[PDB]
Amino acid sequence: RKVYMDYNATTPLEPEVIQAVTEAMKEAWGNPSSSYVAGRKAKDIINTARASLAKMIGGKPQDIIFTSGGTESNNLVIHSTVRCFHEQTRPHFITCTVEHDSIRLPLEHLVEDQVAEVTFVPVSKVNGQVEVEDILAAVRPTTCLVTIMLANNETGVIMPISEISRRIKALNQIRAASGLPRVLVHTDAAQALGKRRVDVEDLGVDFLTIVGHKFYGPRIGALYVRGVGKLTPLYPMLFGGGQERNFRPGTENTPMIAGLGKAADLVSENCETYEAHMRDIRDYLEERLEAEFGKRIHLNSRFPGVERLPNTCNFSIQGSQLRGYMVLAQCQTLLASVGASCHSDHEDRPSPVLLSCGIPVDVARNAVRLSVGRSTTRAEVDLIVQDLKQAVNQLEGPV
Amino acid sequence: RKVYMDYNATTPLEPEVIQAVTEAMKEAWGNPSSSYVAGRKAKDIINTARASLAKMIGGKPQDIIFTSGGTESNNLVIHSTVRCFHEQQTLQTRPHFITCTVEHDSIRLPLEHLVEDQVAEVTFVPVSKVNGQVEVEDILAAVRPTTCLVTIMLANNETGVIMPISEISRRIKALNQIRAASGLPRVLVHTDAAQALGKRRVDVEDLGVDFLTIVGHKFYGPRIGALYVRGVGKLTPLYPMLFGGGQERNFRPGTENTPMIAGLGKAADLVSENCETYEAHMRDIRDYLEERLEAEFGKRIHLNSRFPGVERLPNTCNFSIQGSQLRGYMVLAQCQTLLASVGASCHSDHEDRPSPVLLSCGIPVDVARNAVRLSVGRSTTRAEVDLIVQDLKQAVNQLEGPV
Ligand SMILES: *Cc1c(COP(=O)(O)O)cnc(C)c1O
Numbered sequence: 001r002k003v004y005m006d007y008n009a010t011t012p013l014e015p016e017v018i019q020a021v022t023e024a025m026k027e028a029w030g031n032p033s034s035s036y037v038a039g040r041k042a043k044d045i046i047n048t049a050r051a052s053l054a055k056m057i058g059g060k061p062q063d064i065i066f067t068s069g070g071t072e073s074n075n076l077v078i079h080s081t082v083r084c085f086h087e088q089t090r091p092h093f094i095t096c097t098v099e100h101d102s103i104r105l106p107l108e109h110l111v112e113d114q115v116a117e118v119t120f121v122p123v124s125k126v127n128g129q130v131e132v133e134d135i136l137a138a139v140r141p142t143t144c145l146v147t148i149m150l151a152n153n154e155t156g157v158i159m160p161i162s163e164i165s166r167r168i169k170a171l172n173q174i175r176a177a178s179g180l181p182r183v184l185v186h187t188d189a190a191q192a193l194g195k196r197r198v199d200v201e202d203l204g205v206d207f208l209t210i211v212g213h214k215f216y217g218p219r220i221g222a223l224y225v226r227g228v229g230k231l232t233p234l235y236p237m238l239f240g241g242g243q244e245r246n247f248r249p250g251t252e253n254t255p256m257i258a259g260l261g262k263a264a265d266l267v268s269e270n271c272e273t274y275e276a277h278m279r280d281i282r283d284y285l286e287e288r289l290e291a292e293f294g295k296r297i298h299l300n301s302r303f304p305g306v307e308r309l310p311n312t313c314n315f316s317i318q319g320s321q322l323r324g325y326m327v328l329a330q331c332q333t334l335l336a337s338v339g340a341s342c343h344s345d346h347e348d349r350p351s352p353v354l355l356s357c358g359i360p361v362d363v364a365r366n367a368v369r370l371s372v373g374r375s376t377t378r379a380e381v382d383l384i385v386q387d388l389k390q391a392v393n394q395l396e397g398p399v
Numbered sequence: 400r401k402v403y404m405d406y407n408a409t410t411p412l413e414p415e416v417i418q419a420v421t422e423a424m425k426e427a428w429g430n431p432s433s434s435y436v437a438g439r440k441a442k443d444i445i446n447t448a449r450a451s452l453a454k455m456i457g458g459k460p461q462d463i464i465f466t467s468g469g470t471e472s473n474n475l476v477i478h479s480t481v482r483c484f485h486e487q488q489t490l491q492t493r494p495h496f497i498t499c500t501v502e503h504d505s506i507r508l509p510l511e512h513l514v515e516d517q518v519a520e521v522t523f524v525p526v527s528k529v530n531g532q533v534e535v536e537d538i539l540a541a542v543r544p545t546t547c548l549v550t551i552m553l554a555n556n557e558t559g560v561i562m563p564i565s566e567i568s569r570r571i572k573a574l575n576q577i578r579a580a581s582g583l584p585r586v587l588v589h590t591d592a593a594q595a596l597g598k599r600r601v602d603v604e605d606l607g608v609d610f611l612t613i614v615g616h617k618f619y620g621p622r623i624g625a626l627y628v629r630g631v632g633k634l635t636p637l638y639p640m641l642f643g644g645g646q647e648r649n650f651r652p653g654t655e656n657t658p659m660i661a662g663l664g665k666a667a668d669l670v671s672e673n674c675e676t677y678e679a680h681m682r683d684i685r686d687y688l689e690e691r692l693e694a695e696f697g698k699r700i701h702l703n704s705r706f707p708g709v710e711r712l713p714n715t716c717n718f719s720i721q722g723s724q725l726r727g728y729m730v731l732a733q734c735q736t737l738l739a740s741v742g743a744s745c746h747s748d749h750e751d752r753p754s755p756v757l758l759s760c761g762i763p764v765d766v767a768r769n770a771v772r773l774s775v776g777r778s779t780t781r782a783e784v785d786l787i788v789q790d791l792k793q794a795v796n797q798l799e800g801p802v
């Protein structure tokens with residue numbers, strides 16, 4: 001046995017989800033657009049999953065659009081916002097400096113191409129959180145969208161989405177006084193789902209990104225769009241056959257949708273359970289890491305007075321020989337990462353997100369991200385703490 | 400009890416494909432970008448599938464980019480072309496595209512959108528009203544100084560007619576030498592091969608194309624797809640529509656759907672190993688079907704997939720039985736065994752407007768209004784053909800009988 005502690009990179013599929021995908025491949029294989037029963041059958045599994053996703057986040061079914069994953073969902077909100085601005089001088093966006101590559105790069109690309117302007121608001125180097133005032137201060141007459149991740153994938157810090165939406169709703173009243181349209185709010189909730197409750201009315205957002213493989217579901221995803229086509233405009237990236245009410249054309253992937261729906265049902269039924277278990281194992285892990293390493297360890301996810309994911313513990317051990325990727329190379333049991341899985345090609349570099357959060361360069365170079373899951377046990381925490389002790393001995397030696 | 404004859408709309412998964420998706424879900428669930436053995440094993444399934452797709456089309460693994468399906472592949476080539484024309488100019492005004500009038504919605508609509516938004520110009524070349532085929536000389540005659548992409552489907556989904564892709568590529572290759580001499584941009588060629596894969600040999604060296612769309616669910620694979628780009632990064636550029644984590648060499652970012660890719664690769668392996676058997680089986684069944692339809696309906700039937708001098712898919716038989724009461728959707732509604740369609744699946748929401756594709760092909764409206772598309776598959780038998788010819792006779796009688 002290896003001990004997996006990289007659930008923020010991806011999650012295995014729950015057996016009920018594997019079953020739903022398999023059943024659908026075999027039994028609901030018809031084109032969902034087809035007029036005969038074989039078609040109507042797959043369409044029913046898709047409608048049921050649409051309702052499952054909406055229930056998971058406290059929304060309505062018609063507010064859910066299925067996509068190929070979180071990258072597409074995030075690019076779609078951004079693309080749609082540009083088109084909306086042109087159907088209403090460049091559109092302006094507000095986001096923060098620790099967003100996932102699928103929010104940061106499409107925005108950097110719009111800037112390079114001179115299509116839009118973007119303020120990448122820095123996060124507080126004190127609490128690793130973006131500050132609401134900095135967002136509000138960045139609004140311009142051409143600002144069209146605020147996009148801020150619900151939870152950070154490397155630190156686990158929760159951003160104040162609710163407060164941002166509330167304050168942006170107020171500003172929107174005054175903006176209308178000057179005939180200016182509304183600033184909308186999107187949150188990338190990839191890392192919050194199945195780890196803490198997510199409710200769109202509580203968050204106040206107009207768009208929200210859902211990523212299946214972060215909550216034991218298949219590698220597809222969706223986009224919540226508040227009262228889509230009525231309350232909130234959505235302009236497509238793709239053109240074709242009319243599926244997803246023309247917001248996302250292409251023959252629907254029924255099996256993946258069935259599994260995302262089943263995965264969503266498990267989050268609706270058990271989210272608090274998953275949360276409590278993750279918290280229990282993560283706090284135990286931090287207790288053990290401090291007990292074994294003392295003043296040599298730094299807990300990079302424990303920013304003062306801010307909420308954080310229940311399962312995440314990003315940490316560093318003091319020492320020149322303890323660069324994160326070298327510590328993990330020496331471990332024999334633990335499976336973890338030094339940052340985003342998609343950043344695995346530059347692991348010898350300190351995480352720019354940790355740098356953005358005010359973590360010193362020498363501390364960031366040594367960072368390892370442990371993210372626990374629904375099955376993780378205290379016996380497993382003990383095994384990887386022991387593994388980390390031997391790895392640190394091999395590299396830094398005794399101190 | 401039912402007999403499926405709508406394989407051009409979608410195909411069931413072969414058992415081996417299902418097994419491949421299922422094992423991959425259980426055993427290769429790791430993030431392919433991860434630096435530990437869990438992530439390297441999924442990357443390996445992904446690598447093997449990429450070679451499977453390349454072998455199926457006569458190409459090389461590095462020239463295959465996984466996508467979410469045919470719609471994305473098609474939209475991606477069009478988007479990349481716009482970006483490419485612009486990068487070339489900057490590095491040095493609207494790009495021009497040539498297509499035909501019977502393409503799938505995922506090629507026609509993105510192009511129409513480009514014209515509405517004044518981003519590109521596009522010539523929608525009409526197919527021949529004699530042979531339902533777009534003609535090489537008409538495509539060549541539509542070439543402009545700013546033409547940069549010709550995109551023509553290899554096979555039409557409604558009629559089954561094969562377009563002259565190889566000759567189009569050969570003629571464009573000769574034309575490109577003349578454009579280079581004067582400094583004009585080269586014209587690239589893409590073919591949407593959705594309906595040809597698994598039904599006839601598809602070889603990119605024979606076809607001469609620069610891009611080719613692959614759609615899994617048309618060849619008994621999962622609902623994802625791929626895009627072939629010739630010599631990507633060396634002979635042909637590919638500018639992404641999506642931005643993110645670096646997957647698919649940044650041409651198509653996002654964590655890879657390993658199970659779907661596994662299924663797609665296994666589906667491609669079956670095509671590579673058995674395409675000739677599938678093709679010949681389909682042709683025998685479809686030709687028996689046309690014989691039987693003519694034997695039963697005589698001069699009342701019109702075979703709409705029998706154009707002169709052109710090749711067609713081996714499994715497709717679009718037909719109309721004459722009569723005011725035999726509109727396609729009405730015939731199928733009375734059928735008790737046959738499962739087929741009146742046109743493409745995505746046009747199901749307007750089963751009563753006579754097919755624009757058939758009208759473009761010269762089929763008169765009285766015949767087009769009554770068209771039904773039968774498309775047979777790997778498992779279809781001659782006995783099943785007889786069951787549905789009987790089903791059709793019964794349906795026709797109900798429709799024309801007492802009130
Ligand atoms: C099926 C098909 C496609 C792809 O459509 P999807 O709904 O994305 O699977 C593209 N072109 C043709 C001609 C097709 O038949």
Ligand SMILES: *Cc1c(COP(=O)(O)O)cnc(C)c1O
Pocket residue numbers: 008069070071072074100102149151152153188190191211213214644652653654655
């Ligand atoms: C996983 C994740 C995504 C989605 O990435 P994909 O590779 O498309 O699954 C988006 N945002 C965040 C914060 C994530 O952690």
